[PDB]
Design a protein around this ligand. Sequence first.
Ligand code: SF4
Lengths: 84, 97
Amino acid sequence: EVPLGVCTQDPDRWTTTPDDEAKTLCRACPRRWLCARDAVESAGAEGLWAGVVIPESGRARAFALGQLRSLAERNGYPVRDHRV
Amino acid sequence: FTLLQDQLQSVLDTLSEREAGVVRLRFGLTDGQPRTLDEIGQVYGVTRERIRQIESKTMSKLRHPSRSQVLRDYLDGSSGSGTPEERLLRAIFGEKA
Ligand code: SF4
């Protein structure tokens, strides 16, 4: 099976207090572009997904979700629009 | 086989004590009776607005793959249950998952 992201160990270091070592691990993550799709499809995704810390609001959040949508599609994980 | 109840317990243990308690109260994992946000403010002694902030933020922690990716496989078997666990799962994953 595609393995779990290492984030499942120490979830808070991705969801709540992300640091550079966590982002480094996302860059090496085998499910990174699946994770980027899922960030766009998740209600209110926040924090470190797919190597991108998603801001909680504003145009910065719009940019991060736009980038993750485009990278997801580009790597074979297009967002299902019926699920956004 | 790890039961959904046991997987949810392990996931909830990754939350702060107050986040876990708010979640359990909200979805009736405590006794089978879900609580309104006003009632959860009743408990914990905070305003309805803080219960709402905690709930939204905790829900986004639970949706992140660090907590959601092993729960996602239970959704289809749990959907249509009528259970509190299905209720929490559906709140995490939404109604189109
Ligand atoms: S890319 Fe996603 S699944 Fe992989 S470690 Fe990062 S947050 Fe976890």
